[PDB]
Design a protein around this ligand. Structure first.
Ligand SMILES: OC[C@H]1O[C@H](O[C@H]2[C@H](O)[C@@H](O)[C@@H](O[C@H]3[C@H](O)[C@@H](O)[C@@H](O[C@H]4[C@H](O)[C@@H](O)[C@@H](O)O[C@@H]4CO)O[C@@H]3CO)O[C@@H]2CO)[C@H](O)[C@@H](O)[C@@H]1O
Ligand SMILES: OC[C@H]1O[C@@H](O)[C@H](O)[C@@H](O)[C@@H]1O
Ligand SMILES: [Mg+2]
Ligand SMILES: [Mg+2]
Ligand SMILES: [Mg+2]
Length: 365
């Protein structure tokens, strides 16, 4: 009691958040400690269920319905004046069983990131990437590298031709899952065909793809706004644009709302409200985080007006509008775990595309 402990993922601007915390302490005398534990999103329900953990947890909104279902989150209590400061759809992302259970911070979607000096006119279709890779390979380069270990990054291609997570009835139907339909299989088959053709490697992860793109070894990558800061520091002149189409249809990235939840076991709920409402969710607070690692589009209207001019933010929102907001329902984690296994198994040859996605479908339903 009398201090704030915050958990936020290691790819976000946690040093910039810590600067917001130091301003909070200067004004209130209350120490703010920012940590970025690994697997924090799995650790939180295990320690919050024993009355331990951080006061505030940051994650995309898809994790928070499971937390709320287990009673681990405090209902947030912003007045109507504060609610009108943020975009209504961001509040929708953090509403569960009619109650607001987090503060929305930022809106994230994946984009195509490309090296302007290797591919001045980036490809508009996935289907043209193998021919581009062939020309780059004679120069000792590759067309594209992105994280193949996390299903977040492969989902936009799987969804393009018809894959989906849970069908929404304008409630989600947890038994109507689109992981093993013909569109999902077509997109995962194309990924596997690029791997078989040695346009990509099944073992490429986040670090490998980031290093290759930022050193100028691959012409393109797929990542979110948090990655731009490291590219700014690199020698690479990059642009951010629409994901390629597949079979003429847009890639459909899942849209995540970075959100801050207050632990139901926190003895500091009033302090957490003060910090999130009056320090973080201000133009100056978001700027401090954004200058560390870019947040993407932000939930705070006044600051989003200042970011909307950036072509990288414009591309982020264009991809977001072609994609889908993630469900926040507890079943979303089962979806992600099952799809992760399916993609890794198909990409590594441990299963066929059909057998992998059928098994995921059975697991989820
Ligand atoms: O044992 C397998 C892995 O299990 C753990 O990872 C899980 C997560 O616990 C799940 O929540 C889920 O992860 C989703 C995530 O919830 C979702 O928001 C999105 O994550 C993006 C994030 O929004 C974005 O801001 C940025 O940080 O990139 C993330 C993606 O890397 O998508 C995730 C799914 O890819 O599913 C994974 C399993 O895939 C555990 O943390 C791992 O250590 C473990 O490998
Ligand atoms: O966090 C990285 C992950 O790598 C995967 O191969 C493992 O199955 C997980 O337990 C972890
Ligand atoms: Mg983690
Ligand atoms: Mg509640
Ligand atoms: Mg792995």
């Amino acid at each position: 009691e009398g201090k704030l402990v915050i958990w936020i993922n290691g790819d976000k601007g946690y040093n910039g958040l810590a600067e917001v915390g130091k301003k909070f302490e200067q004004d209130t005398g209350i120490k703010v400690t920012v940590e970025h534990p690994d697997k924090l999103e799995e650790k939180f329900p295990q320690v919050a269920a024993t009355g331990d953990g951080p006061d505030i947890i940051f994650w995309a909104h898809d994790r928070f319905g499971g937390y709320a279902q287990s009673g681990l989150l405090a209902e947030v209590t912003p007045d109507k004046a504060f609610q009108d400061k943020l975009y209504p759809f961001t509040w929708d992302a953090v509403r569960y069983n009619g109650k607001l259970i987090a503060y929305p911070i930022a809106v994230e979607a994946l984009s195509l990131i490309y090296n302007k000096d290797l591919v001045p006119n980036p490809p508009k279709t996935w289907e043209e990437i193998p021919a581009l890779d062939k020309e780059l390979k004679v120069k000792g380069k590759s067309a594209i590298m992105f994280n193949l270990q996390e299903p977040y990054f492969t989902w936009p291609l799987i969804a393009a031709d018809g894959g989906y997570a849970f069908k929404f009835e304008n409630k989600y139907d947890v038994k109507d899952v689109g992981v093993d339909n013909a569109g999902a299989k077509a997109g995962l088959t194309f990924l596997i065909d690029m791997i078989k053709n040695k346009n990509m490697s099944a073992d490429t992860d986040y670090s490998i793809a980031e290093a290759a793109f930022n050193k100028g070894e691959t012409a393109m990558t797929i990542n979110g706004p948090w990655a731009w800061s490291n590219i700014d520091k690199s020698k690479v002149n990059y642009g951010v644009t629409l994901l390629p189409t597949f079979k003429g249809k847009p890639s459909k990235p899942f849209v995540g709302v970075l959100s801050a939840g207050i632990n139901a076991a926190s003895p500091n709920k009033e302090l957490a409200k003060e910090f999130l409402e009056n320090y973080l969710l201000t133009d100056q607070g978001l700027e401090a985080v954004n200058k560390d690692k870019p947040l993407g589009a932000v939930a705070l209207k006044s600051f989003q007006e200042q970011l909307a001019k950036d072509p990288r933010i414009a591309a982020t929102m264009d991809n977001a509008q072609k994609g889908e907001i993630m469900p926040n329902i507890p079943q979303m984690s089962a979806f992600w775990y099952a799809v992760r296994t399916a993609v890794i198994n198909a990409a590594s040859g441990r299963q066929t595309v059909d057998a992998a996605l059928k098994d995921a479908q059975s697991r989820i339903t």
